[PDB]
Amino acid sequence: NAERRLCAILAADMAGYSRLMERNETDVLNRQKLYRRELIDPAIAQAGGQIVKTTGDGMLARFDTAQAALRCALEIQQAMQQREEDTPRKERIQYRIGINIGDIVLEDGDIFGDAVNVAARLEAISEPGAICVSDIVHQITQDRVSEPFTDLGLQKVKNITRPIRVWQWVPDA
Amino acid sequence: NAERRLCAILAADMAGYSRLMERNETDVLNRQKLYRRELIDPAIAQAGGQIVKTTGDGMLARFDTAQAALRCALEIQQAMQQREEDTPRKERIQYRIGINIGDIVLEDGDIFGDAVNVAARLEAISEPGAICVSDIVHQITQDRVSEPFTDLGLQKVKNITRPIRVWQWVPD
């Protein structure tokens, strides 16, 4: 029924647009529906990945190589910079993205393990429009990608005793 | 016309309900709209705080004392856990709250300065339903507020140079 493998996990969520604005932002919510369909979902497929699920926590996808997770996120984040550049800053749609690696368990279209929790957390602390990757991901990908990353220091993650060293890339702006 | 002063700054946003789900926003907007006016806005007003503004980044409020701000956050977070313990964990509403203190600028219904941005960052990285405060708030409140906090590490805040140490209180 269920297996263990080494996997590249990618978590993503949408930044911004607080529900406390007490307003239905149908225009903005329709744009993101569009990007998911035209930008994200495609880049992920092109890159060999599979979406595992989208939940209240956001979306979770997995890849066979660390490289493919990362080029996929870079592909997404760089296009989003272009796609939203003629929209004013405080109104732009931006995603956050985290990527990690680990032995995790798969079982019935869902994934399990610390390493997944860590991808999710990376997404949450990532800055909007950027990509945060764990140190493991960084040691493997640093030389495969021209884009630069910056050490962010240690990050404690709920129910993981050992904190993780987190590297971040932000777009040229 | 402007004004410079040392303030406690509370940032709060709503966790969860990722829009990558594409669910009907309508229902969740309403529930939060209720909590805002029955639970939140009054707690703040009872504690002597003032709502400064709300935006895409959430709500900012200011208090005259560190303890008032933290008392208010605690009161909100504790209630929200009770008001929501009947509903299923996945369909619950929860806030993240951050609190920082610093020399801000008050001008024309708005609040400006780094201590503000720091408070917004703490809100962002806080656990759903929890409270994150900066070390400064922690050292000023430790001995007047019994609720336990956990040292969460140093935290690089965007465009500020020294990491701030962050303390986190979770509800049980």
Side-chain angles (χ1 to χ4, degrees), chain B residues 10 33 41 45 54 72 83 117 136 143-144 148 151 157 166:
Chain B
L10 196 147
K33 183 175 181 172
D41 286 6
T54 304
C72 177
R83 295 231 222 316
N117 294 4
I136 297 163
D143 291 352
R144 298 292 133 195
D151 175 341
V157 175
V166 178

Side-chain angles (χ1 to χ4, degrees), chain A residues 82-99:
Chain A
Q82 298 187 163
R83 302 289 308 258
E84 284 286 276
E85 76 195 340
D86 289 305
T87 298
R89 254 192 56 249
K90 302 177 322 190
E91 294 186 40
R92 290 177 193 156
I93 295 198
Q94 297 172 294
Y95 295 106
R96 286 192 307 263
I97 298 166
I99 299 180

Side-chain angles (χ1 to χ4, degrees), chain A residues 17-19 37 56 125 155, chain B residues 17 19 22 25 121 155:
Chain A
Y17 285 98
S18 174
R19 262 58 100 105
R37 267 156 238 266
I125 72 190
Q155 222 56 34
Chain B
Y17 297 76
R19 298 169 219 273
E22 289 179 18
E25 287 273 274
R121 184 55 187 179
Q155 209 80 219

Side-chain angles (χ1 to χ4, degrees), chain A residues 71-134:
Chain A
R71 293 164 169 191
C72 175
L74 279 170
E75 191 188 334
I76 299 180
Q77 296 301 56
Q78 293 160 358
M80 288 288 285
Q81 158 164 31
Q82 298 187 163
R83 302 289 308 258
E84 284 286 276
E85 76 195 340
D86 289 305
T87 298
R89 254 192 56 249
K90 302 177 322 190
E91 294 186 40
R92 290 177 193 156
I93 295 198
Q94 297 172 294
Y95 295 106
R96 286 192 307 263
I97 298 166
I99 299 180
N100 181 37
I101 277 160
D103 289 345
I104 81 275
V105 173
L106 284 58
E107 185 181 24
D108 301 318
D110 209 341
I111 59 188
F112 306 72
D114 289 3
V116 180
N117 287 11
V118 171
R121 190 52 191 172
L122 263 28
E123 167 283 294
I125 72 190
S126 171
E127 73 191 24
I131 306 181
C132 279
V133 322
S134 69

